[PDB]
Each structure stands twice: as structure tokens, then as C-alpha cells.
């Protein structure tokens, strides 16, 4: 089955012009663990997850841009699911932003979603 | 295959008498996302993961005991692996403390480990 029909459906993103503590509220608010960071257009710059929030406390880092995993692993909306499953394990991550061909963010898949194909 | 032979091998735990920020350093130091919280004996009271650290910032919580998921899902050292895999998805968590029969902590399995049985 294709990623286009499993993914979380309007993405929640953030420009890097926000405080660590705001991001945290964002994550906690929607009950999410993955926050794609987008530029002014909407194109994909990096990814924050609760791990980064705890990195920020741990090393006294203060800005989103300082800690966002600058190089994000992503999925294409026509990329078969099974293949994304394999991808997240092999790289040990639980979520990928889904991108259109311009690196604009159209959604997100988490293992949380993949495990409704586990039954 | 049995959990006893996949698990991470001396556990890293913490009594709740530590600061959020220390826990974070603990997680970042060993490169872990799961911190079992133990009492004076060593028996299993709750679990902290980086998610809780971001909950702590989010709601201005200040103590480990305030935020540790008081009721932890665990695995037995003779519990077959496959079954623990199923357990973490169905409950959407990536790590379980492994317990002996007195609820003392003997190890931990993460999906990170299970995915070396994925090949
Ligand atoms: C974390 S489980 C709850 C849901 O949140 C979704 N999710 C996680 N991160 C995001 C995000 N940045 N935008 C939209 N949905 C998300 C996941 O795909 C899952 O369905
Ligand atoms: C696995 S957690 C360690 C790092 O993984 C990063 N991370 C989580 N998901 C992804 C992804 N899809 N691509 C790249 N890095 C990621 C987080 O920002 C964290 O710094
Ligand atoms: C998170 S991936 C790196 C390793 O850390 C292990 N790990 C995670 N949390 C703990 C812990 N509290 N004590 C010992 N090992 C851990 C995992 O089982 C994995 O092998
Ligand atoms: C899935 S993340 C949301 C909550 O899950 C908790 N959590 C993570 N692993 C476990 C586990 N093995 N048992 C119970 N709760 C857990 C974390 O402390 C967090 O508050």
C-alpha cells in the first residue's frame, strides 16, 4: 500500500523562529513526537523531536536551529509503506515527513501509523 | 528467541531523587531514550523517556516523580521476543524494562534491538 494513503494528513510544521519551549508545547498539544521545521516558503530544513528538546536542556542550547537534525530522512507520497517501515528501523527513527518533489511538506508517517497495518 | 538474550545488559536506572535536567544528561550521555526509575531497594516505580522531559518544560513541572509514567509496561526475561514486539506497537512505546519476579530491573529491550532480528 502507498504512503499517500496512510500519512497524517495536514502536516504540523514550524519555522525555526520559535523557542525550544514553544516547540515542546506544540508536541505536547497535538500529542506528537515529530516536528518538521520549514522555511518561509514551506520547504523542509530539519526535524525536531522530543529527543532534541532533552538535548537542549542537556547542553544548554537555546535556539531551534542549533539542534534541529539538519539532515532529515523523508518519504515520498508514492513510496510503498513497507519500504518506509524498513527505512525507519534501519535508521532507527519513528517518523518521516512526506515530501512533494520540491521538498515541501505534505504529511508525515510514524510507526504509530504503520502499526495499523500490523493488525 | 527469548528476551533474556537480546536485552541491554546492565540496566541504567535512577531513583526519583534527581532533577529533570540530570535525567536528560543521563539519556544524552548513554545515547538512550528510556530511563527506568527505581526505589531504594531497586524495584520498578516508573519510567522516564525524552517525551516526559518535554512534558516537564511544557507544563513547568519540576520533579521526576511528578512526570514519570507511574504505570510501566514491562517484559520478563523468559518472554519470547516476538511477543514483546507486538506489545510495544499495540501500546505504542519503543522500550520495556525487563523485570525479575520481584519487579527488580534486570535489563531493557528497545525496538532498536528487535530490529536486528529484522535483518
Ligand atoms: C504520534 S501518534 C498520533 C498521530 O500524530 C501524527 N503526527 C506526528 N507528527 C505529526 C506532524 N508533525 N504533523 C501531523 N501529524 C503528526 C502521527 O502520524 C500519528 O497519527
Ligand atoms: C533517533 S533520535 C536521534 C535524532 O534523530 C533525529 N530524527 C528523528 N527523526 C528523523 C528523520 N526522519 N530524519 C532525520 N533525523 C531524525 C532527531 O532529531 C534526533 O536528533
Ligand atoms: C537507544 S539505542 C542504544 C541502546 O541503548 C539501550 N538502552 C536504552 N535504555 C537503556 C537503559 N535504561 N539501560 C540500559 N540500556 C538501555 C537500548 O536497548 C539500545 O541497545
Ligand atoms: C509513548 S510516549 C507517552 C508516554 O509513554 C511513556 N512510556 C514509554 N515507555 C513506556 C513503557 N514501557 N511503559 C509505560 N509507559 C511508557 C512515557 O513516559 C510517556 O509519558
Amino acid at each position: 500500500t502507498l504512503v499517500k494513503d496512510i500519512l497524517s494528513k495536514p502536516p504540523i510544521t514550524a519555522h525555526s523562529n520559535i523557542s525550544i519551549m514553544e516547540a515542546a508545547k506544540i508536541l505536547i498539544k497535538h500529542n506528537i513526537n515529530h516536528l518538521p521545521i520549514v522555511d518561509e516558503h514551506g520547504k523542509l530544513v530539519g526535524i525536531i523531536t522530543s529527543w532534541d528538546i532533552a538535548k537542549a536542556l542537556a547542553q544548554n542550547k537555546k535556539t531551534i536551529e542549533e539542534i534541529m537534525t539538519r539532515n532529515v530522512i523523508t518519504a515520498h507520497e508514492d513510496e510503498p509503506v513497507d519500504h518506509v517501515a524498513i527505512k525507519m528501523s534501519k535508521y532507527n527513527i519513528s517518523g518521516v515527513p512526506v515530501v512533494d518533489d520540491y521538498r515541501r511538506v505534505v504529511g508525515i508517517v510514524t510507526s504509530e501509523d504503520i502499526s495499523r497495518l500490523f493488525g
Side-chain angles (χ1 to χ4, degrees), chain A:
Chain A
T1 189
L2 296 183
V3 149
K4 55 150 41 66
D5 50 52
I6 272 84
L7 58 84
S8 294
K9 283 129 155 239
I12 314 167
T13 44
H15 325 272
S16 35
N17 69 355
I18 51 160
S19 160
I20 324 279
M21 218 268 221
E22 196 181 350
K25 278 184 195 156
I26 271 150
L27 299 185
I28 302 311
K29 192 195 171 185
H30 303 82
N31 196 31
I32 55 147
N33 194 34
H34 293 88
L35 192 57
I37 312 301
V38 296
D39 56 37
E40 68 267 36
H41 308 283
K43 319 260 260 244
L44 180 58
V45 217
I47 193 169
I48 290 293
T49 75
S50 68
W51 171 267
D52 311 301
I53 322 289
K55 189 95 94 163
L57 253 201
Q59 318 160 326
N60 300 94
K61 312 274 145 148
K62 218 172 206 73
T63 61
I64 293 276
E65 57 210 346
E66 249 191 304
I67 197 52
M68 51 164 257
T69 293
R70 219 155 179 266
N71 162 76
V72 182
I73 293 90
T74 66
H76 204 280
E77 80 190 321
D78 274 294
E79 206 172 302
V81 151
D82 321 24
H83 200 239
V84 185
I86 293 144
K87 203 198 284 170
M88 291 174 300
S89 25
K90 167 174 165 182
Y91 276 90
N92 263 126
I93 46 160
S94 26
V96 287
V98 186
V99 282
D100 81 2
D101 278 304
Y102 306 63
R103 295 199 98 260
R104 224 172 275 284
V105 175
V106 301
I108 185 157
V109 181
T110 54
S111 40
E112 289 95 284
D113 314 299
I114 309 265
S115 65
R116 294 212 175 119
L117 309 199
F118 241 116

